[PDB]
Amino acid sequence: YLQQSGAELVRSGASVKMSCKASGYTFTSYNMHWVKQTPGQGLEWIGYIYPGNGVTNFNQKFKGKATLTADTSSSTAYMQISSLTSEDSAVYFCASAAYWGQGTLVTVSSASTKGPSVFPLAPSSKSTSGGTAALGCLVKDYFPEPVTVSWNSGALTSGVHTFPAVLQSSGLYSLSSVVTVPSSSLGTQTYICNVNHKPSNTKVDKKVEPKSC
Amino acid sequence: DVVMTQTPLTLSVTIGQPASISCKSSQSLLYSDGKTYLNWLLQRPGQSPKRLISLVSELDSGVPDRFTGSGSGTDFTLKISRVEAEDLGVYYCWQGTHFPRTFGGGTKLEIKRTVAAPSVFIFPPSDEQLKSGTASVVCLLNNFYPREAKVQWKVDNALQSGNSQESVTEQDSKDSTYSLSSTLTLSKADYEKHKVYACEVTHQGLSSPVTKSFNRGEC
Amino acid sequence: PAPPNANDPAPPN
Numbered sequence: 001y002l003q004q005s006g007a008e009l010v011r012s013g014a015s016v017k018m019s020c021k022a023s024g025y026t027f028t029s030y031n032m033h034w035v036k037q038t039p040g041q042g043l044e045w046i047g048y049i050y051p052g053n054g055v056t057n058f059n060q061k062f063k064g065k066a067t068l069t070a071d072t073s074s075s076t077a078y079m080q081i082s083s084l085t086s087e088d089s090a091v092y093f094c095a096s097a098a099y100w101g102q103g104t105l106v107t108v109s110s111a112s113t114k115g116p117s118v119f120p121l122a123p124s125s126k127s128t129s130g131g132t133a134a135l136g137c138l139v140k141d142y143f144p145e146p147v148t149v150s151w152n153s154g155a156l157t158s159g160v161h162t163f164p165a166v167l168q169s170s171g172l173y174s175l176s177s178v179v180t181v182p183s184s185s186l187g188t189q190t191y192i193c194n195v196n197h198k199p200s201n202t203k204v205d206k207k208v209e210p211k212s213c
Numbered sequence: 214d215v216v217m218t219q220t221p222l223t224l225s226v227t228i229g230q231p232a233s234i235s236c237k238s239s240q241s242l243l244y245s246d247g248k249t250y251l252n253w254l255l256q257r258p259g260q261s262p263k264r265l266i267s268l269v270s271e272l273d274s275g276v277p278d279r280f281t282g283s284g285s286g287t288d289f290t291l292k293i294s295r296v297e298a299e300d301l302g303v304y305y306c307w308q309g310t311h312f313p314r315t316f317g318g319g320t321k322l323e324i325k326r327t328v329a330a331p332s333v334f335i336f337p338p339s340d341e342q343l344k345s346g347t348a349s350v351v352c353l354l355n356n357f358y359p360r361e362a363k364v365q366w367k368v369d370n371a372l373q374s375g376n377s378q379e380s381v382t383e384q385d386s387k388d389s390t391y392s393l394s395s396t397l398t399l400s401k402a403d404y405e406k407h408k409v410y411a412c413e414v415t416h417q418g419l420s421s422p423v424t425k426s427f428n429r430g431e432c
Numbered sequence: 433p434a435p436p437n438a439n440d441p442a443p444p445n
Contacts, residue, residue: 043319048314055444119338124336127336132332166379176380
């Protein structure tokens with residue numbers, strides 16, 4: 001198991017530092033790799049550090065830009081990338097032995113962060129189909145990606161569809177997260193969408209209430 | 214650098230079909246300790262990669278025995294004896310023998326299934342959003358196959374263009390369907406000029422187009 | 433518990 005640090009917004013020319021905490025295997029017995037995922041979903045190897053002795057090896061493309069370190073007392077690996085440009089916006093993974101981290105999204109931009117507005121998609125007779133009802137939350141006008149959305153503090157996962165964000169003509173992002181549930185249930189169950197946007201330190205919980213129509 | 218050539222680019226398979234993916238390296242992957250460091254990964258839609266196979270043929274803990282890896286030297290194959298719905302995603306090979314480490318370009322495995330019509334739902338704008346000066350109307354198409362679908366907005370029966378955005382999910386790992394949202398956005402002033410808001414959906418699973426609609430202010 | 437195989441060889445000291 002590899003747990004990476006959260007998404008980052010960083011200015012052009014600045015640096016970023018991200019971490020990867022390891023558990024459940026011998027950290028010092030395997031190379032710790034860092035890998036960039038390109039927009040077209042190719043994977044590109046950056047380098048590794050072998051935590052048993054600190055030796056690093058790099059892709060020539062990232063030499064002089066990437067620094068890799070490993071703290072054996074806390075089983076944590078770090079990658080720093082300096083002099084960032086637009087081509088460095090990507091998801092970055094760590095990988096070691098049989099495991100991959102969940103990825104860290106890095107957006108290189110000089111624009112200010114903006115937290116989302118959250119609005120309910122309320123269920124009604126117009127969002128019923130064959131005995132089920134749909135409801136959701138519209139998460140609008142944030143920058144940069146990502147927002148994470150959970151329902152009922154992560155207790156509600158079945159039938160949830162959190163759509164890929166769209167880019168609005170303003171340059172801000174928007175997404176919706178929806179769930180289908182029994183329509184018989186809307187008077188007794190509570191559906192709360194939990195929206196987190198780390199770059200703006202925004203946390204919103206919104207209870208979605210039915211419309212009477 | 215050692216180039217990893219993966220084929221095919223896409224696999225479109227039915228449940229139960231065998232599948233195979235080829236990875237050819239531009240140089241031998243035999244290392245001087247006698248091992249061949251060829252790994253296979255699966256990245257399901259929305260997730261990080263997971264390793265399935267290392268040292269050409271050795272399955273990782275928890276990987277179903279439907280998967281087998283074979284090969285030597287420069288030619289390697291991943292085979293699935295019978296595809297299951299959860300096998301969808303992008304498979305990658307990657308070699309650990311040479312510097313830099315390198316990955317194949319990926320093979321996307323998509324599931325072909327029976328046609329399934331969308332369930333269609335519509336959401337009027339919230340009062341919270343209207344108070345802020347904007348009205349977003351959402352049309353949702355849930356759990357359909359194939360992915361092609363036509364969604365048209367009509368406002369007082371006038372066909373709309375230029376004011377909506379769509380987003381589609383990845384294929385579902387359990388039922389192999391897609392879902393889609395279409396969001397019509399207007400200023401409050403424009404929203405308030407019209408009465409009937411409708412989304413009309415055409416899809417191969419529907420015997421005729423489905424319309425969901427509401428009158429402004431009835432909800 | 434049989435440790436996972438390496439992805440690639442470790443470097444010498």
